[PDB]
Amino acid sequence: KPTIAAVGGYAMNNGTGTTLYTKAADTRRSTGSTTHIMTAKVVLAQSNLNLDAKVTIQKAYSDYVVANNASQAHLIVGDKVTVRQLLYGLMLPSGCDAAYALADKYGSGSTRAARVKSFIGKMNTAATNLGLHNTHFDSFDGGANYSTPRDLTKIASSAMKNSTFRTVVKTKAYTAKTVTKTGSIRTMDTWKNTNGLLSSYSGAIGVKTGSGPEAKYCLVFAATRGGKTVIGTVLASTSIPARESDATKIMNYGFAL
Ligand SMILES: [Cl-]
Ligand code: NA
């Protein structure tokens, strides 16, 4: 059994559900940007989902990232961006502006505030339907926003059942071509997936990085080797390189078990 820096860790065989590794696997901690996983999951499960539906980037999404020093996809105010493009913006560069846009689009309500609240409600309902008990969301991008290595792994496993989600999280780079106010096509700066495992770990296929002042360095990981898929989560590691290493050790351990 490997030693990891993270104070929370968990891994299982995605196909069988069998646990492969645990470390305070059911201890509630802050999730940071790993919350984006649930946001993507909820969006992809919407009955009225249209990946090609366009959303206009509101001034509010931009002001929000600045006011909260949040990670962003650099969405330009006035631009028309599709739900698909927003999903890449959410999962690769950890775009909280993309998260805001998606919550605004799929939440139910007459105001942005009402729709954001409704969307967060859907996130909690989603956790409930998964039979989770140690997860609560109070945001769409990450004290009332917490989870555990086990719960987050279950959430990710559920999301991975969607082919679109799988396609997005295994993508290393994506360049969105958005529609300008004048109707022209803008080639945005390329988005790179913040998950270094995609390039450092052979067989890596997901899932999502996360960080925060309270959550520290987190990472939900997945990889396939020899027809076996290991999926897991590390919470509160000490650095970006440390979280990547923690995940690498856990997956290597899980594959060798
Ligand atoms: Cl991060
Ligand atoms: Na992140």
Side-chain angles (χ1 to χ4, degrees):
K1 202 193 168 158
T3 283
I4 64 175
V7 282
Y10 182 81
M12 76 181 182
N13 173 313
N14 194 232
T16 64
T18 300
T19 301
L20 304 169
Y21 176 94
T22 66
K23 179 173 187 193
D26 297 291
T27 294
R28 296 169 183 194
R29 305 198 191 277
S30 302
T31 49
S33 6
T34 58
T35 284
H36 294 206
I37 295 169
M38 183 50 103
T39 296
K41 181 167 135 62
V42 170
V43 165
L44 289 169
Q46 289 317 280
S47 62
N48 73 306
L49 175 76
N50 181 6
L51 252 13
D52 294 312
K54 256 156 191 54
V55 156
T56 292
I57 302 306
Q58 306 298 129
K59 174 53 171 195
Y61 308 160
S62 182
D63 282 341
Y64 175 82
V65 297
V66 177
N68 288 276
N69 272 123
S71 283
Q72 54 159 330
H74 306 274
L75 297 170
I76 301 147
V77 181
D79 272 23
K80 276 128 240 87
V81 188
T82 63
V83 172
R84 178 184 291 99
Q85 278 165 166
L86 289 176
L87 284 166
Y88 279 99
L90 170 85
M91 306 304 283
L92 268 55
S94 197
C96 294
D97 45 348
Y100 199 166
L102 289 168
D104 196 6
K105 168 77 174 176
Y106 290 107
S108 192
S110 291
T111 61
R112 178 168 313 118
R115 297 195 288 278
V116 165
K117 277 275 117 241
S118 157
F119 190 84
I120 292 172
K122 295 181 194 225
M123 295 172 72
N124 282 312
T125 292
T128 285
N129 294 338
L130 271 170
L132 311 183
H133 297 290
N134 298 315
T135 298
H136 185 75
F137 298 102
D138 206 13
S139 68
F140 50 67
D141 55 3
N145 204 84
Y146 57 79
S147 197
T148 66
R150 189 193 308 268
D151 279 22
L152 261 189
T153 296
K154 301 300 191 224
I155 292 166
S157 173
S158 180
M160 291 291 276
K161 293 215 287 197
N162 186 286
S163 53
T164 301
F165 184 92
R166 289 202 299 278
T167 293
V168 172
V169 305
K170 71 179 163 226
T171 305
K172 302 223 263 318
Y174 185 90
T175 300
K177 317 297 253 50
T178 60
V179 182
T180 263
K181 246 161 159 160
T182 74
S184 64
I185 299 324
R186 184 208 308 287
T187 294
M188 280 183 73
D189 303 302
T190 302
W191 292 328
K192 299 289 147 98
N193 201 308
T194 52
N195 179 9
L197 298 179
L198 290 188
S199 67
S200 76
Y201 197 92
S202 190
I205 62 169
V207 176
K208 177 80 181 73
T209 56
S211 65
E214 312 308 328
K216 298 319 150 121
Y217 301 90
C218 315
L219 177 53
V220 172
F221 52 86
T224 301
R225 286 195 176 168
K228 178 158 157 180
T229 296
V230 173
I231 189 150
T233 300
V234 284
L235 291 183
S237 194
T238 58
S239 77
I240 290 181
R243 77 174 173 201
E244 296 210 358
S245 175
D246 283 348
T248 296
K249 288 185 262 183
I250 292 173
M251 286 189 292
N252 280 169
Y253 175 60
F255 280 125
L257 275 178

